[PDB]
Swiss-Prot record, chains A, B:
Binding annotation for pyridone 6: 88, 90
Name of the encoding gene: DAPK3
Modified residues (Phosphoserine): 44
Organism from which the protein derives: Homo sapiens
GO biological process terms, semicolon-separated: apoptotic process; apoptotic signaling pathway; cellular response to type II interferon; chromatin organization; intracellular signal transduction; negative regulation of translation; positive regulation of apoptotic process; positive regulation of canonical Wnt signaling pathway
Phosphothreonine PTM sites in chain numbering: 171, 216, 256
Name of the protein in question: Death-associated protein kinase 3
Length: 275, 275
C-alpha cells in the first residue's frame, strides 16, 4: 500500500554530499532500479540537506523529460528523512570510468558519444532546461562492452528551467549596476561544458585544471587553455574548431546546440566502430 | 458571493505596462480601496501580460508582509483576463510628486522620510525580500499636507525572496565562466537605490541621468556621479558620506540596511519639522 514498501533496498552504489544511491528491487515485478535518497533539509533556515523547493525542481524536471539518452524516473516516495527517487538502473558505468580505461578516444569514438550527448542536450534545450552539471561522471553507459556504447544523461540536481525574462518600462535612474549589467545563466553554460567534455574525450587532459581549485577557477574565467602537442599533435582542424567555438568567454558568442549539431565535425560521415 | 461582485469599480488612478489601477468601493462596508488589475499572460510562450508565476510571486510577498510603512493587500480576485489586487487606498500622492513641488528637501526633511523608508526596507530585508524597484514613484504618502508625512512602500512587481545559495562539492573542471563568476542579485541592490533616493531628495538632481537611456546605464555601471556645487554647496559631510557608502559598485562593499540605520546622519538628533 505504501509505495516505500514496494521496494526492497539493497547495497550502496554510491554517495554524494546530499544523496545516497542504493540498488533496489520492485517486490512484485522483480525488476531492479536505482534508488536515490535525497536528505531533506529540516528547517528553512538550515544550511544542510536539500530544501523542498530544490527537490521539487529536480523531480519536476525528471517528470517532464522523456528521451532515449536521458535517465527515466520510475517512481518516487518520501519518508521522515528523505525523498527517494526510483530511477532506471543503468549498469555500464560512467563515461568517466570508460575514458579512464581507454586513456583517450579517437575522433570516431568521441563523435559516437558526442552525437548522443548533443541529441539529449538538444532535447533539454528545446524544453528550456539547462542541465548545468554536464561532465563525464554524469553520463552513464547502458553497456560498456559494445563498440558504440549508448548513453544516458543523469543528475538533474542543479538543472533549471530558463525563462525568457528581464522594470524595463520604468526609469532606470535608481537601479543598481549589478542589475544594469545582469545577464541570467542559461543554455549556453551547457555548450561550454560540451566543449570541455570534447577536449577531455580526445586527450584524457582536462583543459583548465590547475594545481589548486582556485587555479582551475582562474583558468576557466580567463579561458586559459591550449591544444598541447603532447595530446593533440594529430587532432583534426575540424575537432579543434568545434572545441574553440564552444570554449568562448562570452556566452552569447558560443555555438548553440543547433549550431553544434550542424558543425562539420559532427555532420561528417564516419564508420561505426568495430570490436 | 463572487468576490468580484463585492467591489464597485470607479475611475482610473493610473496605468503602467502591465497593470491599471482603479479606485473602488467595497459594497457592504462602503470603504474605498485601490484595485490593481494585472493583465494575465495568455500562453506560456507569449511575451505579453504577466505570467502566473510572476503574479503569484508578487501576491505571495504582499500576503507575507505587514509593516506600518508597507502597503496592505486587502483582498484579491481573478476574472477571465486579469488578477485584481485590492489594496489599501493611499491618497497623499507619491514622494515623486512631493519632491517635484518642494524642488528639494532640507536634511531634516530628507531624514524624516528616509528613517521610514529604512524601517520598511529593514523589515523586507529581515524576511529576505529585495524590493528591486525602490524609487520616489513607489513611495506613497498618507497625507501630503502635514509637516512630517507618513509613507508606504508600494509596487512589489519585481520583488523577490533571496535564498542563501550556490555543485560546490563536485569538480569545477566543466563549469562555464559565467557560473564560476556568478553572483546572485540580492538585498544590496535596494541599498544602492536608497543612496540614489537620498541624493535626489537633497538636490532635485538625478545622479546618473544622461541625455539618453544608454548614457544613464553607462553612468550607473561606472558609478559616474559627483556632488555638484549647484546643489550640494551647503550639504553636510555626514549626508555626503551616507550617500557615498551606498553608491558603491561592488555590492559586497555597500552599507547594509543595519549599517545605514546606525549611520551618524540617520542617528543624529533632529527637530520634527514645523508648518
Ligand atoms: C552514485 C551512483 C553511481 C552513478 O554512476 N552509480 C550508479 C549505478 C547504477 C545506476 N543506475 C542508475 C543510476 C543513477 C541514475 C541517476 C542518478 C541521478 O539522476 O542523480 C543517479 C544514479 N546509477 N548510479
Ligand atoms: C498608478 C496608481 C497611482 C500610484 O501612485 N495612484 C494611486 C492612487 C492611490 C492609491 N492608493 C493605493 C495605490 C496603490 C498601491 C499599491 C500599488 C502597487 O503595489 O502596485 C499600486 C497603487 N494607489 N495608487
Amino acid at each position: 500500500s505504501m509505495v516505500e514498501d514496494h521496494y526492497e533496498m539493497g547495497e550502496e552504489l554510491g554517495s554524494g554530499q546530499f544523496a545516497i544511491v542504493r540498488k533496489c528491487r520492485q517486490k512484485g515485478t522483480g525488476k531492479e532500479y536505482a534508488a536515490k535518497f535525497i536528505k531533506k533539509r529540516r528547517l528553512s533556515s538550515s544550511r544542510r540537506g536539500v530544501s523542498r523547493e530544490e527537490i521539487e525542481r529536480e523531480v519536476n524536471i525528471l517528470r517532464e523529460i522523456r528521451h532515449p539518452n536521458i535517465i527515466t524516473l520510475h517512481d518516487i516516495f518520501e519518508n521522515k528523512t528523505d525523498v527517494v527517487l526510483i530511477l532506471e538502473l543503468v549498469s555500464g558505468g560512467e563515461l568517466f570510468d570508460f575514458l579512464a580505461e581507454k586513456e583517450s578516444l579517437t575522433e570516431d569514438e568521441a563523435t559516437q558519444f558526442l552525437k548522443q550527448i548533443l541529441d539529449g542536450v538538444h532535447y533539454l534545450h528545446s524544453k528550456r532546461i539547462a542541465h548545468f552539471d554536464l561532465k563525464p561522471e554524469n553520463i552513464m553507459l547502458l553497456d560498456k562492452n559494445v563498440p558504440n556504447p549508448r548513453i544516458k544523461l543523469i543528475d538533474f540536481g542543479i538543472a533549471h528551467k530558463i525563462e525568457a525574462g528581464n522594470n524595463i518600462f520604468g526609469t532606470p535612474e535608481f537601479v543598481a549596476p549589478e542589475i544594469v549589467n545582469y545577464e541570467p545563466l542559461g543554455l549556453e553554460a551547457d555548450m561550454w561544458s560540451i566543449g570541455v567534455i570534447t577536449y577531455i574525450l580526445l586527450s584524457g587532459a582536462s583543459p583548465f585544471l590547475g594545481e589548486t581549485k582556485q587555479e582551475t577557477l582562474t583558468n576557466i574565467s580567463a579561458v586559459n587553455y591550449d591544444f598541447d602537442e603532447e595530446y593533440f599533435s594529430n587532432t583534426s582542424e575540424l575537432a579543434k574548431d568545434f572545441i574553440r567555438r564552444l570554449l568562448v568567454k562570452d556566452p552569447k558568442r558560443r555555438m548553440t546546440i543547433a549550431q553544434s549539431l550542424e558543425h562539420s565535425w559532427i555532420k561528417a560521415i564516419r564508420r561505426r566502430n568495430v570490436r
